[PDB]
Amino acid sequence: MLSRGLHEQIFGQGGEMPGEAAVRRSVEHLQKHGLWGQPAVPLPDVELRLPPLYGDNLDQHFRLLAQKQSLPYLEAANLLLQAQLPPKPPAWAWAEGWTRYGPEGEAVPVAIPEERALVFAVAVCLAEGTCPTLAVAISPSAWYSWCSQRLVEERYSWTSQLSPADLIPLEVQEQLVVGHNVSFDRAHIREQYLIQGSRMRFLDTMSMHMAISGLSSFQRSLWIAAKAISSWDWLDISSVNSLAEVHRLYVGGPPLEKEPRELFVKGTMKDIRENFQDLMQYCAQDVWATHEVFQQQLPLFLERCPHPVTLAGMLEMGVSYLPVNQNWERYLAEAQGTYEELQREMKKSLMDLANDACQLLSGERYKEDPWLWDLEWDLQEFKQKKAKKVKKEPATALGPCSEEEEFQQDVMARACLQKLKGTTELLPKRPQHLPGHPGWYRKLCPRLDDPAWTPGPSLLSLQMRVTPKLMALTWDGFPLHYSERHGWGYLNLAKLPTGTTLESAGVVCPYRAIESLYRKHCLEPYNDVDIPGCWFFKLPHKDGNSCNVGSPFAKDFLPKMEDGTLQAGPGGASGPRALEINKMISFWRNAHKRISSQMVVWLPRSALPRAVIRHPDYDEEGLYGAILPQVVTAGTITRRAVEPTWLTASNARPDRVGSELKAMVQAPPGYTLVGADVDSQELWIAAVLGDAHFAGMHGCTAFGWMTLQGRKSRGTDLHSKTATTVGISREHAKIFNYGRIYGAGQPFAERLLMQFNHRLTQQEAAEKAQQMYAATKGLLRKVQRETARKSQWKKWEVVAERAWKGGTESEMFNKLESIATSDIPRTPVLGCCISRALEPSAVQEEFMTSRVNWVVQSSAVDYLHLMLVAMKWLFEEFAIDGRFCISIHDEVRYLVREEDRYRAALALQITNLLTRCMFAYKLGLNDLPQSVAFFSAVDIDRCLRKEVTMDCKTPSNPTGMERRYGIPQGEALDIYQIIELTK
Amino acid sequence: ALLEICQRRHFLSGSKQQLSRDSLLSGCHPGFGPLGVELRKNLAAEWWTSVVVFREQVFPVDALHHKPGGKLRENLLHGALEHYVNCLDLVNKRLPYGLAQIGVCFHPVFDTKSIGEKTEASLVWFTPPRTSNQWLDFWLRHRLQWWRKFAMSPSNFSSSDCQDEEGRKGNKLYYNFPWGKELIETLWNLGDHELLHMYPGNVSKLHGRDGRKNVVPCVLSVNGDLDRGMLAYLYDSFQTRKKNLHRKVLKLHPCLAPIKVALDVGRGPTLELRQVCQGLFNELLENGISVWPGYLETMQSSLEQLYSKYDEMSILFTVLVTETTLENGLIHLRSRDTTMKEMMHISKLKDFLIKYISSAKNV
Amino acid sequence: EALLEICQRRHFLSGSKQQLSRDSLLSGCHPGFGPLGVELRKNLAAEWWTSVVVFREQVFPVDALHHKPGPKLRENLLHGALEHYVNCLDLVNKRLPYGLAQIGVCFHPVFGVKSIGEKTEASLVWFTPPRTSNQWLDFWLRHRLQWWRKFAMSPSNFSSSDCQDEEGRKGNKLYYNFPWGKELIETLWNLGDHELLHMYPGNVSKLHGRDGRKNVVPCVLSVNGDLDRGMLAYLYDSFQHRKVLKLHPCLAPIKVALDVGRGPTLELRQVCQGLFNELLENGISVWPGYLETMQSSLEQLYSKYDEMSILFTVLVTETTLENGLIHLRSRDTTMKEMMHISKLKDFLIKYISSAKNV
DNA sequence: GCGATACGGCACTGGCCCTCGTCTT
DNA sequence: AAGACGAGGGCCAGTGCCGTAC
Numbered sequence A: 001m002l003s004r005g006l007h008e009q010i011f012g013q014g015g016e017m018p019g020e021a022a023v024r025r026s027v028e029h030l031q032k033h034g035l036w037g038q039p040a041v042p043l044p045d046v047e048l049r050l051p052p053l054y055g056d057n058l059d060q061h062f063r064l065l066a067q068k069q070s071l072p073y074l075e076a077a078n079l080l081l082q083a084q085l086p087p088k089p090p091a092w093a094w095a096e097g098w099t100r101y102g103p104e105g106e107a108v109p110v111a112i113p114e115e116r117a118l119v120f121a122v123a124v125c126l127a128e129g130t131c132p133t134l135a136v137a138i139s140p141s142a143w144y145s146w147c148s149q150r151l152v153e154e155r156y157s158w159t160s161q162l163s164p165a166d167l168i169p170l171e172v173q174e175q176l177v178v179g180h181n182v183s184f185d186r187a188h189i190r191e192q193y194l195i196q197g198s199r200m201r202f203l204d205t206m207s208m209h210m211a212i213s214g215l216s217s218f219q220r221s222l223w224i225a226a227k228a229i230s231s232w233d234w235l236d237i238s239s240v241n242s243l244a245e246v247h248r249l250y251v252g253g254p255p256l257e258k259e260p261r262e263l264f265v266k267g268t269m270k271d272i273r274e275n276f277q278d279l280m281q282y283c284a285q286d287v288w289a290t291h292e293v294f295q296q297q298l299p300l301f302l303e304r305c306p307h308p309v310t311l312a313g314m315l316e317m318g319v320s321y322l323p324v325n326q327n328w329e330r331y332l333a334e335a336q337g338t339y340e341e342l343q344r345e346m347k348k349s350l351m352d353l354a355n356d357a358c359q360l361l362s363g364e365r366y367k368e369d370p371w372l373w374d375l376e377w378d379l380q381e382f383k384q385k386k387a388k389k390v391k392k393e394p395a396t397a398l399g400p401c402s403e404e405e406e407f408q409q410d411v412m413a414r415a416c417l418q419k420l421k422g423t424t425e426l427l428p429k430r431p432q433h434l435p436g437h438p439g440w441y442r443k444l445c446p447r448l449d450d451p452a453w454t455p456g457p458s459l460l461s462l463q464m465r466v467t468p469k470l471m472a473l474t475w476d477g478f479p480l481h482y483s484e485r486h487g488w489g490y491l492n493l494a495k496l497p498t499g500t501t502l503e504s505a506g507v508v509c510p511y512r513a514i515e516s517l518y519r520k521h522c523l524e525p526y527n528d529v530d531i532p533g534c535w536f537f538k539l540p541h542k543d544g545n546s547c548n549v550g551s552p553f554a555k556d557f558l559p560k561m562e563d564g565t566l567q568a569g570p571g572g573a574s575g576p577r578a579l580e581i582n583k584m585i586s587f588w589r590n591a592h593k594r595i596s597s598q599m600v601v602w603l604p605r606s607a608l609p610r611a612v613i614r615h616p617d618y619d620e621e622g623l624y625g626a627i628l629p630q631v632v633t634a635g636t637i638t639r640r641a642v643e644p645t646w647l648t649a650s651n652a653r654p655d656r657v658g659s660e661l662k663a664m665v666q667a668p669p670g671y672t673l674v675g676a677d678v679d680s681q682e683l684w685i686a687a688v689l690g691d692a693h694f695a696g697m698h699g700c701t702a703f704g705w706m707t708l709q710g711r712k713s714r715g716t717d718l719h720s721k722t723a724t725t726v727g728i729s730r731e732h733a734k735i736f737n738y739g740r741i742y743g744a745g746q747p748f749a750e751r752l753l754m755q756f757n758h759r760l761t762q763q764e765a766a767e768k769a770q771q772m773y774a775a776t777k778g779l780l781r782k783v784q785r786e787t788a789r790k791s792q793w794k795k796w797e798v799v800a801e802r803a804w805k806g807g808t809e810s811e812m813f814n815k816l817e818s819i820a821t822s823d824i825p826r827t828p829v830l831g832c833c834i835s836r837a838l839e840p841s842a843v844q845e846e847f848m849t850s851r852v853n854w855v856v857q858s859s860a861v862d863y864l865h866l867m868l869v870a871m872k873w874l875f876e877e878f879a880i881d882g883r884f885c886i887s888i889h890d891e892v893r894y895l896v897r898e899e900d901r902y903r904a905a906l907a908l909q910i911t912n913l914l915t916r917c918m919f920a921y922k923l924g925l926n927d928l929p930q931s932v933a934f935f936s937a938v939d940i941d942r943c944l945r946k947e948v949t950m951d952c953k954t955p956s957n958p959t960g961m962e963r964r965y966g967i968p969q970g971e972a973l974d975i976y977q978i979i980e981l982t983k
Numbered sequence B: 001a002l003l004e005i006c007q008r009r010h011f012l013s014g015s016k017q018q019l020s021r022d023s024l025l026s027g028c029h030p031g032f033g034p035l036g037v038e039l040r041k042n043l044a045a046e047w048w049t050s051v052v053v054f055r056e057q058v059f060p061v062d063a064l065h066h067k068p069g070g071k072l073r074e075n076l077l078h079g080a081l082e083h084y085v086n087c088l089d090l091v092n093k094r095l096p097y098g099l100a101q102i103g104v105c106f107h108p109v110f111d112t113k114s115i116g117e118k119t120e121a122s123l124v125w126f127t128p129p130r131t132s133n134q135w136l137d138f139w140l141r142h143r144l145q146w147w148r149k150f151a152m153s154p155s156n157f158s159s160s161d162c163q164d165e166e167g168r169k170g171n172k173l174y175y176n177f178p179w180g181k182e183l184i185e186t187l188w189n190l191g192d193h194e195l196l197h198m199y200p201g202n203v204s205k206l207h208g209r210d211g212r213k214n215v216v217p218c219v220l221s222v223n224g225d226l227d228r229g230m231l232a233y234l235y236d237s238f239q240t241r242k243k244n245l246h247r248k249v250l251k252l253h254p255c256l257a258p259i260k261v262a263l264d265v266g267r268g269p270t271l272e273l274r275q276v277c278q279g280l281f282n283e284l285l286e287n288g289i290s291v292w293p294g295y296l297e298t299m300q301s302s303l304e305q306l307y308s309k310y311d312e313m314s315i316l317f318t319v320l321v322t323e324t325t326l327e328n329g330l331i332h333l334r335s336r337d338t339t340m341k342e343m344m345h346i347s348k349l350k351d352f353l354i355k356y357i358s359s360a361k362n363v
Numbered sequence C: 001e002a003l004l005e006i007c008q009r010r011h012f013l014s015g016s017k018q019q020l021s022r023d024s025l026l027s028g029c030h031p032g033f034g035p036l037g038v039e040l041r042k043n044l045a046a047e048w049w050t051s052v053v054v055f056r057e058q059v060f061p062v063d064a065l066h067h068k069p070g071p072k073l074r075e076n077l078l079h080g081a082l083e084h085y086v087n088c089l090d091l092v093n094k095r096l097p098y099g100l101a102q103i104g105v106c107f108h109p110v111f112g113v114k115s116i117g118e119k120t121e122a123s124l125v126w127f128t129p130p131r132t133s134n135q136w137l138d139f140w141l142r143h144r145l146q147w148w149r150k151f152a153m154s155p156s157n158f159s160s161s162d163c164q165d166e167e168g169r170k171g172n173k174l175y176y177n178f179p180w181g182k183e184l185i186e187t188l189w190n191l192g193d194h195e196l197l198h199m200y201p202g203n204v205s206k207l208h209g210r211d212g213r214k215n216v217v218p219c220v221l222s223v224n225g226d227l228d229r230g231m232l233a234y235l236y237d238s239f240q241h242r243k244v245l246k247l248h249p250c251l252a253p254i255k256v257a258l259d260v261g262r263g264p265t266l267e268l269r270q271v272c273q274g275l276f277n278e279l280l281e282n283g284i285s286v287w288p289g290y291l292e293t294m295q296s297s298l299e300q301l302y303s304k305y306d307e308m309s310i311l312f313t314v315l316v317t318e319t320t321l322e323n324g325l326i327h328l329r330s331r332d333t334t335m336k337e338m339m340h341i342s343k344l345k346d347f348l349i350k351y352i353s354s355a356k357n358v
Numbered sequence D: 001g002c003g004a005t006a007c008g009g010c011a012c013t014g015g016c017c018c019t020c021g022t023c024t025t
Numbered sequence E: 001a002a003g004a005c006g007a008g009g010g011c012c013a014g015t016g017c018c019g020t021a022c
């Protein structure tokens, strides 16, 4: 009720828009495809009084919302644009706080630069960071320079107080702060860490550059290489995200000089004061260049991104807020402890193996070792120069008692010892590494004159290249090896020749111990090359490899390590345990710097909600604080968020060490976070782009009908329907599908599905070939399919027809290619044109995949922005405290309070409904299916995580530590209306 | 189960043949050799460092071996419990606070009528009821961490979570001997029962300031058998397939290793400026590093003999003084972990040893 | 006197009200020991083991059982050392005279009913040829006397007496003047092989060690010192309106203590924790009085730290959070000094190392 | 014709450059 | 006695492979 999926809506009375011919085509298509076995399972319709609409459509609704949200900031931006500039001061004031430079650059001591808008770039001495040290900010009126409290030499104690720069004005509109990577500067703002607030938003020239004239990483690689027929035309129309480069692009003036000494990151606080004036000058140059860049970008961005939803969305997407406490510090300590322990064990075992294998140097018995014969095995004993002389060999030159009368003979032997000691020093010069030990052992040791010297062979690894060959047995074979690739593995007769000969002089090789090892292995070039395992003699060549890259070292083959082949020796379960240890510390190894240095400011009891103090939590002399994620508003592509740490934050896995990082963001007492993850966005996006193209309805496609048919709760989604084939649930099937939409390469899908399902390649190939039915078919000498009914002809001039390309049957890649063909905007809907570097006008373009992905992911990001502005609209309109946003692409979580959580979740549901209805309206019809209108899962709890139930590794007991639980949602939240008076 | 000969030959234990696993696990052994009591000495010292010194609120306690009112003490927990009030006074009633003591305890054993003694290191941790379990898990992880280091294969040391007959939580620590796991340390949470029974009159002298309020202390307790632990490290030090070549050597941690370095005389014979060995000797012992003297000898044999002799004594390094070193000043050095000849300078050798041990204490 | 009371309030001895007398202290009966006394005994025993490890050629440490092997508690620390003689013979390779040192808690009956007292004694059993036993006994006499003399505030307080009998041909006993009465502190006897020939007959062919191509059953030197009586000795040796115990720097249990002066601030505790860790990193016992909680007075605090024999007291004011300067205060001179916090470790270490002389 | 957008890590390496050594004038 | 070629080690950026998220 009706039309195979719709709800009670007041978003337009008319309407059909029947398209009887089109729906006959669609029905016939879906019959021959064929799907005509409807389950007839109507989802429970919801009857609630919707929030007031402003008319006429929801388009003007979101437009007026986005405009009324971004109007003051646009005004401030315009104030920055028409700003007439007063020149830089002749000298910078060496005074704490802000210094205003107005007429002739006079120094006027100010606490807070009262301005509507300003550019900003903070400085911070990395030597003892991360506390601000300098800052410069220009305004449409005059100049400003902020100096930190680091003007007096003291023995400071840094617990990250409210020492960051003060920028906001007190009440008892309003603000806009622009800057290159403005999030970093925002992180150094005093009033941004407060639980409440804030009016001040931020605009990023880097993100804006990315929106206007951005380029992919693959482009960045060959862009900087400038130092594929028409692939170099966009080279001068775009640039990298660097400030100097983006200024050279948008301003095109003289090249701005950068600090040659890198004093802020390389030097101490001492050499900063010595060059204070110069550093201040450089900072001023930075804020000036950024000012210019902004001035030239704002109208360009306004042109390229005309819809205000993108603007306001980018405004709210830049003020993220992560509340934390002492549990953060405890987390750091415990995680680093566990990491150091596991690393200690691993390095202990490996250095043990490296110690007990060092003994077979005497005498020349290392050649017999089938693993250790490539390396050095050097024996050095240098050196000395003659000074003593002459002409005599220096190489050869039971009594019971109780005497003590020679009391001071000990000081005689002591004096002789010292006098002997002091004479040898001028014989050697510089202390070299231990020459007695072999070279492989030398390299595997820390230098003697190193401040971080540890005894024995350190620097063992995991993932080094010496140590795995040092101990491991190799796939039913003798040796491992490396050259262009390590020991081959994972990611009509064929024959090859053999050859053995002797010349010299080259390292001896042994091929018997290998065969004998194989004998011992089976005691329990050809043949045995395809499925079994063996090693030849010399060559070296492929002779039976599947992967085209190699893998040093086998670090994710636990199922191939815990099934016999392959194993290690000596010995036992040491191998799989070592792999386990590696897998445990894999995350924290490549992240610990980003989380340990992840700064955080603590707000004292003087500046926190007293209503939270009233709440029965303090907690026991506990410290409350927060950290702003420091997120670049728009990083390619499409204008997605970019953040070094939190966007690549691992999930709740009981295997990884720091896997609790996601769930360490704990809400303050009285507060709780409510969020949701769109399920699913890009899939339904491609679906809609298909059905809306084919006809009017949403279920008029072979692919688009299955997307809006499944429910995750006690049911089966499309991903889940592909995962139960079988099939692997569920993220893997997601990778397979989303990989299929953007290029289901036969070998890619092959080794992928084969990697995930773990079976034999033939049956797998059958499965792929069956699943390859979706992209089929497609289009002098050519592919045997054209617009003509048959390809065969004689002297038939048809160069005018070879201009159409389109797949057939199930999928709708034709529409994505249709958006990928237009030489102009290519923006659906909304609605923002990207990259002067990918716009096919004056581009070859050969960047197709990136642009299909651009289209769908753009729809995803505009979905994100729509969600942001929608959530913001009914959060200020109604009494829902806590408007702070924390978004991760698909997912988005707000920091609400315990008494306004269900209404906030209701706001999330309304938001999702309105956004889906927007995507439906931009293509028609305004009508939308049932199992896609509302969210299925709304997370509501203290710390943010994935599933409502959460286990972890390091703390071992989650609720053991001061925690709570989560709640699935749901249908029970659809009883609390947006009005304050509920329950 | 054949390293015992290495323990007899090189006295880390008694030369008596009757040293069964039962006689070693009961404490009815005739005693430990000098190298053994030295190993246990460094072990107990390493305990005292990583339990008492670095952690504040922990003070040494001296419990007697008997009672004023014949059988001796079974555990040195109660003797430390008797010292609760004064130690409360020296901490200004600031709990959590602990009392630590390493003393030999006497256990009655019916051999299937005798009594066996064994050195035990005990810490009694007086902690508020609000945070009892937290401190229990704390000490669990930390003790287990302390025992899982110094080991060549930390996998052998395990922990077992167990409850009492009434319901009191507790944790045991095991070491995986070649014949199975064996108890080496125990951690229990005593719900202020014994303290209540010891002071029935005025319980006001038991109240400890938890913070904003004075509460009755819950008595955490950790007791570690250092004899079974010394034997555990003794077994762990010794080596196991397709190595193709084997040498008898036990790999003890450089921190707890009985004899650190071994000084000898090479080439040999050389008279009579050999008094420099005395210099290096006193210089070495002055820095607190163990040095075995290879002066008066009957061998006069293959170097492999005394090299293996030192490897059986877990000696870290073998410093060799020869007449060429008497000329220039560069003595020989053979490491234990990696049997390899290496040249070095004298004071450089001293500082190398000090830095070696000190860094071995670290990561 | 007024010394036994400042050992109760400063936790050198255990809490007692009737068994606090000098007679009950000299007796093994206790009221055990306080943390300060325990650390003092540990340092004393450490210096004891250090003053015999420098002794050439080689003396092996051992441990003896407490109860009876045949079913009782030990009185002396001789038998257990005599049981490990034949074994250590292998380790000394029968080459020369050699000794066995050990520190243990031996017992003795103290006299209603009669009880049992404990004492921690340090013994050294030196096996030496009969012809060179007396000379070595005199050697150990001098070395032990000097050992007591080094940490002594007065060498005249320690004395050495000579004696002999039909069972022991020559012996020496080290006394200590209190001066409420000279008391036994250490015994140095020259027992024959009769003690050893009683537990190994026969065939006594194992007992005789090589002595310059000569086989000879060794005479047994019995060193037996008391570390408890020695502890009390140095306690009475350190007692000097002032009431300050000037124990030896290398002997003092707690050698430094640091508090705060400025009103209770977290930063002060941070700095103090820093100095705490730094000093403990180099093996320097530091008393934490910065906890604190009130920091009432300075004079009574100094009195407390002087009754605990603390070498130096450190004060971390608010100026330290600017210039790094810290308020040092000596004990032997009571000079209120000021020095940078960075140069404190080196100063204390150099000061302790400067007390290393004989 | 095609995984896509990021984000970082460590292991290894050829190259610039100072330092010490050593042969050469 | 001064000057020039040569060998060893630190600091640097570049590259290959692995690791996480959506």
Ligand SMILES: Nc1ccn([C@H]2C[C@H](O)[C@@H](COP(=O)(O)OP(=O)(O)OP(=O)(O)O)O2)c(=O)n1
Pocket (backbone or CB within 6 Å): A677, A678, A679, A680, A681, A682, A683, A734, A735, A738, A860, A889, A890, D004, E022
């Ligand atoms: N390997 C991946 C993972 C994700 N995405 C894109 C496609 C998505 O639509 C978007 C969001 O990622 P999700 O993991 O949320 O994908 P789903 O929305 O389909 O999963 P769910 O239904 O659980 O929300 O990111 C992608 O392109 N490639």
Ligand SMILES: [Mg+2]
Pocket (backbone or CB within 6 Å): A677, A678, A679, A680, A681, A890, A891
């Ligand atoms: Mg999703």
Ligand SMILES: [Mg+2]
Pocket (backbone or CB within 6 Å): A677, A889, A890, A891, E022
């Ligand atoms: Mg997602």
